[PDB]
């Protein structure tokens, strides 16, 4: 008959409790300690800027009110207690159409100490907005933050800290890696502060450290235009004398870069910087360009010296461009 | 006030097991972290270990990784650390710390001067 | 571990004059960088915890600054109670002190 007690406890435990306040109303401030270990690491919205994450955001804090000695230390709760007593109205700063799993039922628990330790466990599926300058695409590298704060409370009513050591504060389980083009490098955390016109209030900062997987793109889009350029290259190796091969030749290297660009732009976003796929699909576009003109010049010549100098030279540009911007993307941090 | 009140300084000889105190009075036991730290003369601190005394969960250094035990007794309000098996390089002042959170150690003890010969 | 570098190794400097300690920090510690002063046979008193926020009780004097790894703890006008060894201990990852720059006149 031990479910009584249980039930007496329980039930007895929150009369005389005010939801609306916060934890020691005007005698000191709420240390909510939180933690978050993230179920999966979501795709990045490589389009929208932003990504999605499956956390167990779970965040403690000490409540003298629901206070209990009985014969079991934790006292677990079901939803409906949950709504009854206090919570930390822990929004995400840079938060963007969250949602809180509720299949079969709500996925959050809260266990309540003798001493009155609560532990408020939840599942989510955040989609933070994280701010992307692809500039340096595709090897562009986000730090994207996890910004979570109090809404209503200002600074001096609620704290937020780690409940553990910053470092070993979020921790990311070793299969949850979802994403399709990345590679979720490392975290570091912070806890900031922030000047609103309404007040301060106390952010906790966490930047999700990502690196572009350049494999997808290496393949679909940059060698298939070094090859089309190397056909266009190619071009100049057929006889000046032969009008019509060349004329077929030149125009079918621009069609396919037409292609090849109009598949590019779908891949990313808009973008008004010079972005990987405008630097170099751009310089191709000017070499097979300048092929068309070549052979227009060398149309107008009638092998000769003229010819030949103009194949050779090309090659070599080509492959300084190359090295140039490899070399330079890969080393820019 | 805050008064993280330590024991006094003792001499043993080599190999001989030591236990030293850490009292703290001000404010409730159970809260905060205590935190152990080494000192040898003239060096920085070093970081033993921390106990939570609520539920005793205890962490070590790994160079102290069996080399002192932190133990805590909530009635007494008290952190105890027992080291054994000493040596030359364990003659040092050990404190005994506070963490109220992330950043900072709020509290310290007076200093235990620990000499072994 | 992260390790602590306290660059300066021991600044002397008369009183009413600017003197800066640096802290250097091998790996990210955000803002969890605090510092200490340990006056000789006495136990150690904050001063700065977070990067730049001031304990209170502590005098305007002291300011700290740093952002990621390069923590500077500036005293404005040194007096004759600043003369003393001070550590900036970092607690991002586990805690690790540095090795203690010592003020002299």
């Known amino acids: 008959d031990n479910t009584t007690v249980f039930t007496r406890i329980l039930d007895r435990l929150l009369d005389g409790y005010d939801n609306r306040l916060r934890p020691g109303l005007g005698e000191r401030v709420t240390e909510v300690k939180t933690d978050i270990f993230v179920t999966s690491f979501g795709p990045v919205s490589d389009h929208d800027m932003e990504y999605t994450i499956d956390v167990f955001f779970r965040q403690s804090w000490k409540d003298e009110r629901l206070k209990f000695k009985g014969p079991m230390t934790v006292l677990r709760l079901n939803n409906l207690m949950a709504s009854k007593i206090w919570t930390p109205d822990t929004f995400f700063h840079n938060g963007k159409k969250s949602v809180a799993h509720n299949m079969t039922m709500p996925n959050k628990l809260l266990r309540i100490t003798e001493d009155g330790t609560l532990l408020y466990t939840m599942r989510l599926t955040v989609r933070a907005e994280c701010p992307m300058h692809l500039e340096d695409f595709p090897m562009d590298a986000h730090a994207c933050p996890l910004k979570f704060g109090s809404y209503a409370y200002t600074r001096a009513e609620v704290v937020y800290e780690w409940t553990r050591e910053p470092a070993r504060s979020v921790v990311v389980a070793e299969d949850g890696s979802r994403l399709n083009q990345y590679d979720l490098l490392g975290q570091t955390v912070d806890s900031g502060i922030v000047q609103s016109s309404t007040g301060e209030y106390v952010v906790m900062t966490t930047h999700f450290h990502l690196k572009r997987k350049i494999g997808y793109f290496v393949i679909q889009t940059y060698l298939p235009c070094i090859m089309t350029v190397i056909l266009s290259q190619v071009s100049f190796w057929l006889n000046r004398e032969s009008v019509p091969a060349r004329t077929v030749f030149g125009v079918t290297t621009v069609l396919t870069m037409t292609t090849l660009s109009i598949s590019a732009r779908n891949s990313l976003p808009k973008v008004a910087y010079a972005t990987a796929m405008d630097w170099f699909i751009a310089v191709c576009y000017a070499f097979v360009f300048s092929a068309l003109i070549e052979f227009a010049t060398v149309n107008y010549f009638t092998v000769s010296k003229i010819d030949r100098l103009s194949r050779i030279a090309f090659p070599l540009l080509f492959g300084i461009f190359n090295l140039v911007y490899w070399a330079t993307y890969l080393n820019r941090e | 006030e805050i008064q993280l009140q330590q024991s006094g300084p003792e001499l043993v000889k080599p190999g001989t097991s030591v236990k030293v105190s850490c009292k703290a009075s001000?404010?409730?036991?159970?809260?905060?972290?205590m935190y152990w730290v080494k000192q040898s003369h003239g060096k920085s601190l070093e970081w033993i270990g921390y106990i939570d005394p609520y539920n005793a969960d205890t962490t070590y250094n790994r160079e102290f990784k069996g080399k002192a035990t932190l133990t805590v007794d909530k009635s007494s309000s008290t952190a105890f650390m027992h080291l054994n098996s000493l040596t030359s390089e364990d003659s040092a002042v050990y404190y005994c710390?506070?963490?109220?959170?992330?950043?900072?150690?709020?509290?310290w003890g007076q200093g235990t001067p620990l000499t072994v010969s | 571990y992260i390790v602590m570098t306290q660059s300066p190794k021991s600044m002397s400097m008369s009183l009413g004059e600017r003197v800066t300690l640096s802290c250097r920090a091998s790996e990210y510690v955000g803002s969890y960088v605090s510092w200490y002063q340990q006056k000789p046979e006495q136990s150690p008193k904050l001063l700065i915890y977070g990067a730049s926020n001031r304990y209170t009780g502590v005098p305007d004097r002291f300011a700290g600054s740093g952002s990621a790894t390069d923590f500077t703890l500036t005293i404005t006008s040194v007096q004759a109670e600043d003369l003393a060894d001070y550590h900036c201990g970092q607690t991002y990852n586990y805690p690790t002190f540095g090795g203690g720059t010592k003020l002299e006149i």
């Open positions: 001000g404010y409730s036991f159970t809260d905060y972290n």
């Open positions: 710390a506070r963490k109220r959170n992330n950043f900072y150690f709020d509290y």
